[PDB]
RNA sequence: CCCGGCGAGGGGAGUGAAAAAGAACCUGAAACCGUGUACGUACAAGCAGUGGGAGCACGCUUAGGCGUGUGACUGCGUACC
RNA sequence: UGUAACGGGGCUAAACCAUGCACCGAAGCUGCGGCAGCGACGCUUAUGCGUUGUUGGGUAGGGGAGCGUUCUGUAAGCCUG
């Protein structure tokens, strides 16, 4: 199956055995989760539903990696009325592998 | 005036083809002379037309 | 990150020609720029051109006669200081009919080296005769 | 006793000249020219952070409008007629069938006319 | 068999000697005896005396034959310069920077 | 001792842990001078850079989505204390 | 000086009036995910992570909270051929 779902206010497309990066889930590697906010589902033919979200649909996933992401640099400048102050910017990710897709 | 930047190494073009020369294609060998000689000209031991015409 | 992209390189062309009879020299060039850029046949555009050849063969058969024909100016700098040439639309179709569109369509091709790459495909003819009688340009129709 | 600056010696010139790679002439040798070129490189990476988003919309719409005008209709009338249908739209991100499938596109134009008069 | 010979503090500018170095370097390893004796300017006769001394330092080292040898590297480096003076009107002076070079040659049978 | 002009300089020979410590005599980054292999490349318009990224080498690993280098193609782009 | 009084192609609408909806349009406004402080909370600790309220241009200048150097003591130490 091929699906599309909502997680962390962001949308993600997945086929069985694919992996997706979410935002911070504190449970780390080897833990399992299940998602119900599925928008579309297909077997190579899509259900083409006349309503928001798939009834009885679920997606199964396992954590394969976790932690804090790579740092982004943020600096505030002005010329001849001088300042150059730096702001710190880091965010978190959790990488999850899909084990099943059902409806 | 002075060189504001070092040129790209190609810009020596037509000086680079003259920077060291023989200015001849390509000097000849003789049966009784060691160093090579100029076309229609005498060798470094005085040979011309295969015969010795001057002494060193 | 380096996420791979699929680049096509191979192309073959079947040759087309468009009719100018009863059309305006302004909008004919605007439609020809759109057809050379490919926005009737190919999407996005100007990127990755996979189109086909489209030319003009009867460029002298354009419209507007008896009024606003002794009109327009076509000002050009010859390369000799303030030395300038001017024409009319009448004179342009009477002695420059293949070049009057050639000097105007290049100003609406894509910017940078792609403009030259599309201009090399333009090849306009007048008097109903071309050098492509074995290629061979077939009529463009909708 | 004296501090003698050895805690930071050469380290500021290093931090810029290691970022000066591939730059033309003086920009990859002279620290004053390289520092100025690195702040300008920072300006263009700051502008990408605040301008990149625009070029995703420019991919989506260009393929929809060209394929819709090959179907006799303008993008503004197509996208309005598709919103008039309620749902079945899947957002501008998924309109890629405009360059990937003929039948899925003719069925989307039929949905963009379903609720119209 | 490989021999490396250098001549140091030589009374010529390194860049002027580097003009003849490229004319002898490479070119199917066939510029010595081919044009080296017939090349113009005071730099060519210097690098010829170094090259004929390098092959004599090969015959000093091993056997009696050197006919398998060719030149594989030929380079020149800048010697320590001498700040001299020559006066002018008033003066005022000329810089007259006196220069030297270090010439290195490699000859090999491979 | 060898070449050379009983030159100069190197190159052998002998001493030393080490003479890349040999007289200009310990150690030491650079501006200037210069290297070969890989990669790209032989008509082209602007402050000289920046985000994405084919191809190839180099690296490693089921090679299978990610490191080191270069770079086609392409969105953005009139210095500065 | 060289087109030189639509930006330019070009134009009786593509000029100009007001009228109706669509479409493109910023870091705005909203949503989603976060940051820094503080009033109030929830779940928990080699101790902080969420939830909610509320604020976040700043040179002249005033006032705070951290990072770093060298040296004497600790050093009758510790690291070390």
XYZ file of C-alpha atoms (C1' of nucleotides) in Angstrom:
690
model
C 0.000 0.000 0.000
C 0.849 3.682 -0.595
C -0.591 6.356 1.824
C -0.498 10.072 2.889
C -0.957 11.132 6.583
C -0.764 14.076 9.079
C 1.876 13.993 11.894
C 3.142 16.979 13.936
C 0.906 19.347 11.863
C 2.969 18.339 8.722
C 1.891 15.960 5.894
C 3.931 12.842 4.906
C 3.630 10.354 1.968
C 4.684 6.738 2.746
C 4.868 3.316 1.081
C 5.409 0.128 3.177
C 9.087 -0.058 4.392
C 9.710 3.748 3.918
C 11.073 6.051 6.695
C 9.997 9.611 7.784
C 11.439 12.357 10.058
C 8.996 13.865 12.587
C 9.643 16.367 15.437
C 10.723 15.323 19.007
C 9.277 12.023 20.316
C 11.081 11.320 23.656
C 10.824 7.437 23.552
C 13.953 6.808 21.337
C 15.008 3.681 19.264
C 13.065 0.375 18.880
C 9.698 1.768 20.157
C 6.473 1.413 18.096
C 3.715 3.976 17.281
C 0.412 4.064 15.320
C -1.130 6.950 13.264
C -4.874 7.423 12.438
C -4.959 10.853 10.619
C -4.558 9.237 7.126
C -5.738 11.531 4.257
C -5.405 9.157 1.223
C -4.683 5.414 0.711
C -3.930 3.279 -2.385
C -2.977 -0.245 -3.596
C -1.725 1.419 -6.834
C -5.376 2.524 -7.202
C -6.402 5.322 -4.773
C -9.764 5.196 -2.890
C -10.594 8.760 -4.227
C -12.903 9.496 -1.235
C -15.397 12.440 -1.322
C -14.635 13.205 2.407
C -11.670 14.382 4.608
C -9.552 11.466 6.018
C -9.812 7.628 5.640
C -12.287 5.700 7.856
C -10.738 2.758 9.845
C -7.232 3.570 8.401
C -3.981 3.040 10.412
C -0.198 3.313 9.768
C 2.329 1.330 11.915
C 5.897 2.623 12.495
C 9.049 1.886 14.588
C 11.764 4.385 15.734
C 15.057 3.797 13.832
C 16.879 7.036 14.951
C 16.394 10.096 17.284
C 17.981 13.308 18.673
C 18.934 16.983 18.132
C 19.495 18.064 14.481
C 22.344 20.062 12.870
C 22.744 23.707 14.043
C 21.566 26.662 11.912
C 23.322 30.059 12.308
C 21.206 33.219 12.882
C 22.937 36.660 13.059
C 21.408 40.188 13.270
C 23.503 42.982 11.661
C 23.428 46.735 10.967
C 26.027 48.995 9.238
C 27.185 52.442 10.654
C 24.593 52.221 13.527
C 26.462 49.185 14.762
C 25.341 45.773 16.092
C 26.080 42.082 15.141
C 24.363 39.937 17.862
C 24.016 36.154 17.333
C 20.904 33.982 18.047
C 21.126 30.168 18.647
C 18.969 27.831 16.462
C 18.724 24.013 16.944
C 15.658 21.710 16.510
C 14.834 18.004 17.211
C 13.958 15.008 14.973
C 12.726 11.396 15.275
C 13.187 9.033 12.262
C 10.489 6.277 12.021
C 10.253 3.256 9.616
C 6.769 2.127 8.457
C 6.111 -1.598 9.186
C 2.443 -1.685 7.977
C -0.414 0.293 6.307
C -4.057 -0.944 6.697
C -7.710 0.191 6.187
C 51.266 52.197 -13.727
C 51.605 48.816 -11.907
C 50.135 45.287 -12.057
C 46.867 45.448 -10.027
C 46.421 41.615 -10.295
C 48.641 38.642 -11.335
C 47.411 37.556 -14.830
C 45.830 34.161 -15.620
C 48.857 31.918 -16.490
C 47.817 31.754 -20.228
C 48.289 35.540 -20.963
C 52.084 35.143 -21.659
C 50.862 33.566 -25.033
C 53.128 35.103 -27.766
C 56.048 35.944 -25.355
C 55.951 32.297 -24.046
C 56.499 30.983 -27.634
C 59.709 33.165 -27.808
C 61.076 32.850 -24.196
C 63.846 30.389 -25.311
C 64.724 29.690 -29.013
C 66.882 27.853 -31.555
C 65.203 29.880 -34.399
C 65.966 27.028 -36.935
C 64.271 23.835 -38.300
C 66.321 21.674 -37.407
C 70.178 21.590 -38.006
C 71.986 18.845 -39.994
C 74.465 15.972 -39.279
C 77.891 15.622 -40.969
C 80.170 12.513 -41.272
C 83.355 14.318 -39.974
C 81.831 16.792 -37.417
C 80.594 16.250 -33.803
C 78.110 19.134 -33.160
C 75.225 19.762 -35.675
C 75.459 22.503 -38.361
C 73.261 25.047 -40.246
C 71.714 24.262 -43.715
C 73.919 25.364 -46.692
C 76.656 26.254 -44.080
C 80.040 25.242 -42.582
C 80.653 22.868 -39.598
C 82.504 23.515 -36.273
C 85.618 21.762 -37.769
C 85.543 23.708 -41.095
C 83.720 21.155 -43.377
C 81.741 22.426 -46.412
C 80.516 20.232 -49.387
C 82.008 17.220 -47.473
C 85.605 18.754 -47.566
C 87.635 20.751 -44.979
C 87.995 24.435 -46.094
C 89.211 26.232 -42.853
C 91.256 25.373 -39.692
C 90.611 25.833 -35.934
C 21.984 16.167 1.026
C 22.535 15.489 -2.756
C 19.117 13.932 -3.737
C 19.559 12.534 -7.322
C 17.852 14.104 -10.413
C 17.023 12.372 -13.756
C 18.561 14.401 -16.668
C 17.418 13.647 -20.294
C 20.029 14.321 -23.063
C 18.630 12.638 -26.252
C 16.316 14.422 -28.762
C 14.881 13.873 -32.288
C 12.800 16.447 -34.260
C 10.091 16.016 -36.980
C 9.920 19.697 -38.220
C 6.856 22.023 -38.240
C 5.886 25.305 -40.033
C 3.216 27.941 -39.061
C 1.135 30.105 -41.471
C 1.321 33.961 -41.272
C -1.491 34.766 -43.833
C -3.912 37.428 -42.460
C -1.966 37.789 -39.094
C -0.351 40.896 -37.445
C 3.490 41.174 -37.360
C 3.334 42.019 -33.583
C 1.204 39.065 -32.303
C 2.753 36.608 -34.857
C 6.128 37.239 -33.126
C 4.567 36.972 -29.598
C 3.007 33.560 -30.521
C 6.286 32.425 -32.196
C 8.324 33.265 -29.037
C 5.756 31.230 -26.973
C 6.081 28.272 -29.476
C 9.950 28.444 -29.512
C 10.006 28.508 -25.653
C 7.537 25.547 -25.964
C 4.613 26.775 -23.704
C 2.008 25.163 -26.068
C 3.614 21.626 -25.984
C 6.045 21.320 -22.989
C 5.778 22.294 -19.268
C 8.439 24.172 -17.178
C 9.863 25.680 -19.629
C 12.308 27.467 -20.073
C 14.075 24.512 -18.297
C 15.033 21.189 -20.027
C 13.912 21.829 -23.649
C 12.659 18.614 -25.407
C 10.625 20.402 -28.167
C 10.589 20.249 -31.994
C 11.507 22.721 -34.802
C 8.893 25.421 -35.640
C 9.576 27.918 -38.506
C 7.795 30.448 -40.833
C 7.756 30.136 -44.689
C 5.198 32.815 -45.850
C 6.365 35.670 -43.513
C 5.633 38.298 -46.262
C 1.830 37.477 -46.174
C 1.176 39.422 -42.875
C -1.825 41.812 -42.534
C -2.507 45.618 -42.109
C -2.717 47.431 -45.505
C -4.068 50.815 -46.851
C -3.892 52.414 -43.308
C -1.055 52.198 -40.670
C 1.164 50.396 -43.308
C 3.367 53.501 -43.987
C 4.012 53.430 -40.197
C 6.584 52.358 -37.481
C 10.312 53.421 -37.363
C 12.610 50.402 -36.515
C 15.560 52.653 -35.325
C 19.040 50.916 -35.519
C 22.678 51.919 -34.584
C 25.075 50.757 -37.385
C 28.193 50.791 -35.091
C 29.443 54.159 -36.530
C 28.867 56.804 -33.750
C 25.390 58.573 -33.954
C 24.835 56.855 -37.384
C 21.232 55.590 -37.343
C 18.856 53.850 -39.827
C 15.011 53.993 -39.855
C 12.315 52.093 -41.856
C 8.519 51.681 -42.294
C 6.456 48.457 -42.034
C 5.830 48.887 -45.823
C 9.630 48.994 -46.568
C 10.365 46.125 -44.117
C 7.966 43.721 -45.960
C 9.058 45.133 -49.385
C 12.879 44.492 -48.902
C 13.607 42.903 -45.383
C 10.620 40.438 -44.819
C 12.712 37.642 -43.160
C 14.686 40.068 -40.875
C 11.885 42.387 -39.547
C 10.663 39.546 -37.218
C 14.249 38.306 -36.498
C 15.185 41.714 -34.910
C 12.023 41.664 -32.670
C 11.603 38.026 -31.448
C 15.131 37.870 -29.850
C 14.005 40.601 -27.341
C 11.412 38.034 -25.943
C 13.594 34.859 -25.715
C 14.917 33.686 -22.254
C 17.806 35.660 -20.635
C 21.448 34.415 -20.813
C 22.935 31.619 -23.070
C 19.499 29.910 -23.595
C 18.374 32.954 -25.693
C 21.080 32.166 -28.317
C 20.218 28.419 -28.126
C 16.535 29.182 -29.007
C 17.461 31.855 -31.638
C 19.529 29.198 -33.576
C 16.178 27.343 -34.142
C 14.167 30.393 -35.488
C 15.131 30.142 -39.249
C 12.448 32.370 -40.916
C 11.790 32.295 -44.704
C 9.635 34.400 -47.092
C 8.364 33.889 -50.696
C 6.991 30.367 -49.828
C 10.430 28.643 -50.396
C 12.990 27.155 -47.892
C 16.216 25.071 -47.720
C 14.417 22.190 -45.843
C 12.580 20.280 -48.687
C 13.951 16.886 -47.373
C 13.557 17.449 -43.549
C 10.554 18.248 -44.139
C 8.488 21.018 -42.324
C 4.789 19.961 -42.007
C 1.890 22.355 -41.153
C 1.387 23.167 -37.441
C -2.364 22.789 -36.706
C -4.766 22.660 -33.714
C 53.711 39.144 33.570
C 52.040 39.594 30.092
C 49.274 37.843 28.054
C 51.240 37.955 24.694
C 48.053 37.165 22.577
C 49.089 33.491 21.823
C 45.570 32.310 22.915
C 44.133 33.770 19.622
C 47.205 34.305 17.315
C 46.552 33.312 13.597
C 43.068 31.897 14.547
C 40.978 34.849 13.125
C 42.862 34.839 9.769
C 42.401 30.982 9.643
C 38.599 31.178 10.335
C 38.062 33.439 7.252
C 40.781 32.063 4.883
C 39.436 28.444 5.320
C 36.064 29.840 4.037
C 37.818 31.719 1.144
C 38.316 28.534 -1.028
C 37.716 28.852 -4.816
C 37.254 32.695 -4.663
C 38.926 34.738 -7.428
C 42.399 36.354 -6.980
C 42.747 38.543 -3.841
C 39.465 37.087 -2.343
C 41.336 33.750 -1.624
C 44.635 35.301 -0.284
C 44.009 38.762 1.356
C 42.135 38.459 4.703
C 40.603 42.042 4.494
C 39.159 41.240 0.996
C 38.193 37.668 2.063
C 36.393 38.822 5.289
C 34.318 41.324 3.215
C 33.560 38.542 0.645
C 32.563 36.080 3.480
C 30.060 38.615 5.008
C 28.612 39.020 1.439
C 28.494 35.182 1.090
C 26.616 35.210 4.459
C 24.145 37.833 3.042
C 23.291 35.542 0.057
C 22.886 32.466 2.348
C 20.649 34.640 4.645
C 18.587 35.716 1.562
C 18.184 32.036 0.473
C 16.837 31.275 4.014
C 14.203 34.069 3.342
C 13.506 33.617 -0.474
C 13.822 29.812 -1.336
C 10.062 29.074 -0.659
C 8.941 31.086 -3.745
C 10.521 28.681 -6.303
C 8.347 25.703 -5.147
C 5.112 27.601 -6.096
C 6.779 28.533 -9.436
C 7.201 24.767 -10.231
C 3.603 23.817 -9.234
C 1.678 26.552 -11.144
C 3.813 26.456 -14.359
C 2.877 22.770 -14.980
C -0.836 23.264 -14.067
C -1.453 26.394 -16.249
C 0.357 24.956 -19.329
C -1.579 21.620 -19.099
C -4.922 23.421 -18.344
C -4.466 25.737 -21.403
C -3.773 22.536 -23.445
C -7.290 21.654 -22.066
C -8.818 25.063 -23.187
C -9.064 26.693 -19.634
C -7.040 29.261 -17.566
C -5.395 28.393 -14.185
C -7.460 31.055 -12.293
C -10.802 29.488 -13.508
C -9.518 25.898 -13.017
C -8.320 26.337 -9.369
C -11.480 28.320 -8.406
C -13.770 25.668 -10.048
C -11.801 22.907 -8.195
C -12.288 24.707 -4.806
C -16.055 25.183 -5.628
C -16.410 21.321 -5.667
C -15.635 20.851 -1.901
C -12.635 18.601 -0.951
C -11.140 16.088 -3.562
C -8.321 18.694 -4.192
C -5.251 17.150 -2.374
C -3.493 20.662 -2.453
C -1.174 22.295 -5.094
C 1.751 19.961 -3.992
C 0.016 16.858 -5.597
C -1.008 18.315 -9.027
C 2.126 16.579 -10.543
C -0.131 14.323 -12.742
C -0.162 17.411 -15.074
C 3.244 15.941 -16.269
C 2.869 12.261 -15.088
C -0.637 10.915 -16.143
C -3.198 11.987 -18.854
C -6.306 10.283 -17.353
C -5.847 11.547 -13.762
C -5.628 15.118 -15.200
C -8.802 14.894 -17.398
C -10.648 13.521 -14.285
C -9.352 16.527 -12.220
C -10.612 19.013 -14.895
C -14.001 17.157 -14.786
C -14.009 17.668 -10.942
C -13.138 21.392 -11.516
C -16.499 21.662 -13.475
C -18.780 19.465 -11.252
C -20.317 22.263 -9.079
C -20.521 25.013 -11.807
C -23.311 26.801 -13.777
C 69.681 3.954 -11.901
C 68.794 7.562 -10.913
C 71.142 10.554 -10.222
C 70.085 13.920 -8.703
C 72.500 16.877 -8.940
C 72.108 20.527 -7.827
C 74.168 23.707 -8.397
C 73.603 26.406 -5.723
C 74.163 30.190 -5.417
C 74.513 30.300 -9.262
C 75.039 33.899 -10.595
C 71.710 34.136 -12.564
C 68.048 35.017 -11.692
C 65.867 31.922 -11.135
C 62.977 33.154 -13.399
C 65.389 33.714 -16.382
C 66.687 30.110 -15.888
C 63.016 28.915 -15.618
C 62.470 30.033 -19.273
C 64.968 27.357 -20.535
C 63.771 24.777 -17.945
C 60.341 24.348 -19.703
C 62.089 23.971 -23.132
C 64.110 20.979 -21.727
C 61.309 19.469 -19.498
C 59.090 16.742 -21.051
C 58.672 16.675 -24.901
C 59.143 12.848 -25.184
C 62.257 13.208 -22.894
C 64.204 14.217 -26.091
C 65.456 17.871 -25.802
C 69.002 17.195 -24.446
C 71.472 16.691 -27.377
C 68.456 17.595 -29.676
C 68.375 21.418 -29.011
C 70.243 22.070 -25.669
C 73.629 22.813 -27.414
C 71.790 25.066 -29.965
C 69.475 27.059 -27.586
C 70.083 30.838 -27.208
C 70.781 32.989 -24.054
C 73.225 32.712 -21.098
C 70.834 30.505 -19.048
C 71.041 27.587 -21.592
C 74.862 27.123 -21.316
C 74.530 27.098 -17.475
C 71.919 24.260 -17.398
C 74.001 22.347 -20.030
C 77.094 22.449 -17.697
C 74.901 21.190 -14.786
C 73.397 18.372 -16.974
C 76.838 17.217 -18.296
C 78.078 17.238 -14.647
C 75.006 15.201 -13.493
C 75.687 12.375 -16.044
C 79.410 12.461 -15.058
C 78.223 11.992 -11.423
C 76.305 8.901 -12.717
C 79.499 7.476 -14.387
C 81.341 8.275 -11.071
C 78.725 6.170 -9.170
C 78.144 2.968 -11.294
C 79.728 1.117 -14.287
C 80.926 2.653 -17.606
C 77.678 3.396 -19.591
C 75.200 6.334 -19.346
C 73.391 5.933 -22.765
C 70.110 4.690 -21.094
C 69.702 8.046 -19.186
C 67.096 10.810 -19.822
C 65.979 13.976 -17.868
C 62.854 13.421 -15.653
C 62.813 16.652 -13.505
C 64.474 20.069 -14.096
C 63.676 22.999 -11.763
C 65.210 26.216 -10.369
C 64.695 28.011 -7.032
C 65.497 31.597 -5.815
C 68.916 32.155 -4.124
C 69.566 34.679 -1.255
C 69.692 38.208 -2.824
C 72.194 41.031 -1.992
C 71.031 44.671 -1.418
C 73.655 46.826 -3.239
C 73.644 50.651 -3.789
C 74.469 52.910 -6.767
C 74.049 56.742 -6.252
C 72.047 59.123 -8.534
C 71.525 62.927 -8.939
C 71.686 64.637 -5.452
C 71.176 61.636 -4.446
C 68.908 59.439 -4.297
C 69.970 55.950 -5.550
C 69.334 52.826 -7.703
C 68.257 49.529 -5.994
C 70.519 47.245 -8.171
C 69.345 44.010 -6.462
C 71.999 41.294 -7.143
C 70.479 37.782 -7.378
C 71.337 34.050 -7.418
C 69.567 30.701 -8.076
C 69.637 27.014 -7.052
C 69.301 24.642 -10.089
C 68.260 20.942 -9.612
C 68.381 18.218 -12.348
C 67.291 14.519 -12.188
C 68.530 11.902 -14.723
C 67.024 8.373 -14.893
C 67.013 5.085 -16.892
C 63.187 4.555 -16.355
C 88.255 11.520 -3.614
C 84.647 12.689 -8.699
C 83.074 16.620 -12.281
C 84.993 21.760 -13.083
C 88.345 26.907 -14.691
C 94.431 23.376 -8.960
C 86.857 28.130 -9.991
C 82.249 28.012 -7.430
C 78.728 24.560 -6.221
C 77.267 19.975 -5.565
C 78.329 14.540 -5.323
C 80.874 10.481 -2.966
C 84.101 9.232 1.443
C 84.665 9.703 7.359
C 82.302 11.461 12.535
C 77.011 11.703 15.199
C 70.928 9.182 18.309
C 70.052 13.321 14.292
C 74.527 17.030 9.546
C 66.542 18.202 5.889
C 72.127 20.198 12.959
C 77.991 20.904 7.775
C 79.984 26.481 8.550
C 74.691 31.280 5.633
C 75.915 25.891 11.630
C 68.644 24.806 16.851
C 63.058 25.272 15.556
C 59.276 27.655 12.831
C 53.190 29.202 9.473
C 53.040 32.994 5.331
C 53.074 37.121 1.436
C 56.707 36.239 -3.526
C 58.754 31.869 -6.757
C 57.264 26.673 -8.346
C 55.263 21.301 -8.686
C 51.853 16.790 -10.795
C 47.446 13.948 -10.722
C 42.227 14.148 -10.676
C 37.841 17.106 -12.307
C 35.838 20.842 -15.599
C 36.879 23.589 -20.262
C 38.360 26.496 -26.391
C 33.080 33.013 -28.772
C 31.094 36.112 -24.501
C 28.591 40.954 -21.178
C 28.877 43.349 -15.262
C 31.138 44.048 -7.038
C 32.993 38.326 -9.140
C 29.585 35.467 -4.728
C 24.973 31.991 -2.593
C 20.811 27.780 -2.219
C 19.613 23.027 -5.069
C 22.303 19.432 -8.076
C 23.599 15.297 -13.312
C 28.404 13.406 -14.589
C 33.567 11.609 -12.921
C 37.446 10.505 -9.666
C 38.657 9.500 -4.466
C 36.648 7.107 0.177
C 33.640 3.436 2.577
C 29.642 0.368 2.965
C 25.242 -4.625 0.290
C 27.490 -0.947 -2.836
C 21.405 0.644 -2.121
C 21.094 7.792 -0.083
C 25.613 9.435 1.977
C 31.506 11.302 3.209
C 36.002 13.986 0.349
C 37.107 16.896 -4.152
C 35.447 18.953 -8.952
C 31.558 20.504 -11.903
C 27.223 20.494 -16.333
C 22.417 22.651 -15.401
C 19.434 26.089 -12.585
C 16.300 29.915 -8.440
C 18.884 34.422 -6.031
C 22.669 38.811 -6.623
C 25.303 47.269 -8.037
C 31.916 46.752 -2.668
C 33.387 48.059 2.509
C 35.907 50.081 8.107
C 26.018 62.417 -28.504
C 22.673 58.030 -30.480
C 16.403 55.917 -30.976
C 15.409 59.560 -26.297
C 8.285 62.497 -23.895
C 4.447 53.648 -23.214
C 10.449 50.523 -19.310
C 10.564 47.672 -23.832
C 7.876 44.177 -27.619
C 3.647 46.374 -28.818
C -1.355 48.534 -28.052
C -8.873 51.381 -29.939
C -8.308 49.010 -25.058
C -3.379 46.654 -23.912
C -5.677 54.378 -23.355
C -8.825 56.478 -19.438
C -13.722 55.903 -15.628
C -15.992 52.790 -11.574
C -17.801 47.978 -11.157
C -17.840 42.220 -9.832
C -15.314 37.736 -8.658
C -10.990 35.065 -9.699
C -5.353 34.611 -9.805
C 0.061 36.073 -8.544
C 1.980 38.860 -4.431
C 6.437 39.795 2.317
C 9.682 37.587 7.467
C 2.946 40.860 7.647
C -2.040 38.054 9.931
C -3.217 32.861 11.033
C -1.656 27.559 11.513
C 2.292 24.085 12.469
C 7.226 23.094 14.957
C 10.677 25.787 18.039
C 13.744 29.823 20.713
C 14.779 33.802 25.205
C 12.457 35.940 29.770
C 8.403 35.889 33.303
C 2.930 35.129 35.957
C 0.155 30.119 36.408
C 0.245 24.755 35.395
C 1.144 19.220 33.709
C 4.619 14.961 33.465
C 9.079 13.573 35.547
C 14.838 13.288 37.362
C 23.278 11.090 36.505
C 16.687 17.196 35.537
C 14.557 19.192 33.191
C 10.679 18.240 29.055
C 6.059 19.807 27.638
C 1.128 23.054 28.369
C -0.973 27.937 28.860
C -0.688 33.455 29.505
C 2.280 37.453 27.970
C 6.479 40.372 25.576
C 10.554 40.157 21.991
C 14.043 46.975 15.880
C 17.811 49.868 18.585
C 22.620 53.305 17.400
C 23.547 57.943 22.262
C 23.438 56.272 27.083
C 22.282 53.817 31.931
C 22.188 48.717 34.479
C 22.992 43.464 34.597
C 24.313 37.581 33.301
C 28.372 34.505 31.388
C 33.356 33.067 28.386
C 38.778 33.756 28.170
C 44.284 35.112 29.180
C 48.838 35.559 31.978
C 51.454 35.196 36.931
C 52.390 33.947 42.388
C 50.399 30.369 45.918
C 48.259 25.286 46.029
C 53.380 22.842 43.574
C 58.256 18.893 48.865
C 52.151 17.981 43.754
C 50.635 16.060 38.935
C 51.771 15.113 33.265
C 56.766 13.791 30.527
C 61.711 11.587 26.708
